[model samples]
Target chain A: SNADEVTVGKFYATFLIQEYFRKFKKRKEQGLVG
Target chain B: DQLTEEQIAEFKEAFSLFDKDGDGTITTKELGTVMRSLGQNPTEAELQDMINEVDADGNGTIDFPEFLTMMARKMKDTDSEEEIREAFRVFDKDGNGYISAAELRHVMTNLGEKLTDEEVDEMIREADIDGDGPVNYEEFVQMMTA
Candidate 1:
């Protein structure tokens, strides 16, 4: 169960991290996150 | 467990992007929009689940503090070695390469679940490859990565 919890958390974290980078790139294009 | 200034700034920027409308908080709708923008349209239930997980105040919205906490926890949960090292630094308050039982207990308690002495010992026993008294970074990495 603990392993499952870690796996799920990792999945969620990866999604969020990807979203963060995507948003960062978008913002940079818009002159943000400079 | 203090985040570096750069880390804080990056997190703030990410939060700002999620907190559309400049409301200083992220609503479920905004989260959905973010997900959609990422080409993953989550269902309403999924959005609610995300909110429930990060909305520490129970106000149905994720504020900056809550968002930062969740992000930090999520990063630690990931398989990235660098992220795990960062998390280990947080737990290693003394900056020692090894994590003492007391330090582990303190952090685990802060994470909302206090571990019993037996449980902590069991974890160390399973991960302590060298039979050392405490858990070294190598042992921790092995346990987490395994």
Candidate 2:
């Protein structure tokens, strides 16, 4: 009960998802992509 | 409700990764990894809030249908230029303003469908200016539209 609360709103999931793939795709630069 | 075939293919990969047990549903525990994996430090409350964000139907699990809904919300074709720039960066690697063969090799090898050496060479020829070598921004952009 002592962590920063995740703020929620419209398209919140979309933001999270976009960030995930953005990081996931970053693997390409490092040859870490799969 | 606006989705593209290319996006459908992309979502299929995402769903397969997030899903477990071949049941075609994503549980909280399953999604937790991807959330955290993105280097996001979400509190438990935040995690669920995020999950339910995509998890329609109130069943606490995200099915493919629900997943598509989220994709619709994400892939709105809002900014083609921004996406193209980002896409170019992925292959450009060092951000030196060009995608080198070495960079392309790594990218190709690491993809789910790894391309053959011949295929990689062909890609370069297809994108490089005058088949000289290396794909610059406009060259890369041209390749993408094709």
Candidate 3:
């Protein structure tokens, strides 16, 4: 379950945004959203 | 470990105010203008002492924005509210319990407004909530909170 998400705030801001978008896309692929 | 968000915001506002002359630099004379506006007319010795505490670069004078950044960095090393209050108090010389028109003028002048006395007073009046005849400490806290 821990692997299902990522932590943020300690890294460069751009890097964090990319990570966020990547996770978002992955979540969408799993049919986790409309 | 240093300044909180709230303290940093306050510090920045005050620092910007003292950078008068709008040249992005500050000298002892310009600083005197700020101090006088706050009802203080510190002697040269006193001014130098205050500057020593504030000027991190040891350049014998501070630039307009340098004081803000220095305070932020210095505050990062400690979190004592008393210490924070003392620092704020020194610049807030009016002792109206909060910063007043003159105080804000000293600071804003550096940022280029060079407000008239009436304009500065109006700004203070606008923010004074208790109508206590002056901006007291409680009103100051509220103003900052808002």
Candidate 4:
């Protein structure tokens, strides 16, 4: 269920959404690295 | 039914708040996002249908100006002052056209809340000190302030 995708323009938006995830991808990457 | 000037003003205000991006037609996602912030998120179908229902000009996105007009029209579509008056009268069973604390308590009992006599009387005195028989429209409107 969480992996379902919604198409918007050239991109795909995932459901069970993490809102504004694209804006916070750097923070998520840093957290994983740490 | 024609909306009173006051009702139209209120409808415009509500629409403006709902049309977050100031676009001409609200998208399915925009409406859902706004309503979710208010704790009443719409389902996917509901959002899509609402956009279709209100987009009078067939625009894909809802702008503020169109949104305002749509709200005004929608309100008029369901407008019924008689129904509102009847609802109030049903709550104010004393037939005196005012909702006293006892009346409200009786109404509450139907909704599952039981109050002690003391509690009821205190509420009456606290909320309706004048005890001018029943609360008139002015008092009814004033109650909304609290």
What DockQ does candidate 3 have relative to the true complex?
Answer: 0.02
- Find the candidate with the highest lDDT and give its number: 1
- For model 2, residues B59-100, the per-residue Cα lDDT tens digits are 887788887776565465453444455556556657789887
Overall lDDT per candidate, in order of appearance? 0.62, 0.58, 0.50, 0.46
DockQ head-to-head 1 vs 4, winner = 1
Model 1 residue runs over 4 Å out of place are A1-34, B81-146
Clashing pairs in 3: B2-B75, B2-B76, B17-B107, B18-B107, B19-B110, B20-B110
Kindly report, for each predicted structure in the order presented, the TM-score of its chain A compared with the true chain A. 0.63, 0.47, 0.49, 0.22
True contacts kept of 2: 0.00
Candidate 3 lDDT by residue in tens digits, A1-34: 2211110110111122222233433544585556
True contacts kept of 4: 0.00
Q: Using DockQ as the measure, which candidate wins?
A: 2
Give the lDDT of residue B130 in candidate 2: 58
Minimum summed lDDT over a 10-residue window in model 2 chain B is located at B34-43
Q: Kindly indicate the candidate among 2 and 3 with the higher DockQ.
A: 2
Tens digits of per-residue lDDT for model 1, A1-34: 1232232242243334434234433543585454
Q: Could you give the CAPRI-style class of model 1?
A: incorrect
lDDT by residue (B1-146, candidate 1, tens digit) is 66898676767766776676888988989877754543354678777777777778899888989877876765554356754564455456677688787776665453334456776666557667899688898876675552
TM-scores, in order shown?
A: 0.46, 0.50, 0.43, 0.37
Model 2 lDDT tens row, A1-34 = 3221222222233233333334434543475545
lDDT of 4 by residue, B41-86 (tens): 4468766666665566776665656655654443443333333343
Q: Rank the candidates by lDDT, best first.
A: 1, 2, 3, 4
Query: Quick one: best TM-score, which candidate?
Result: 2
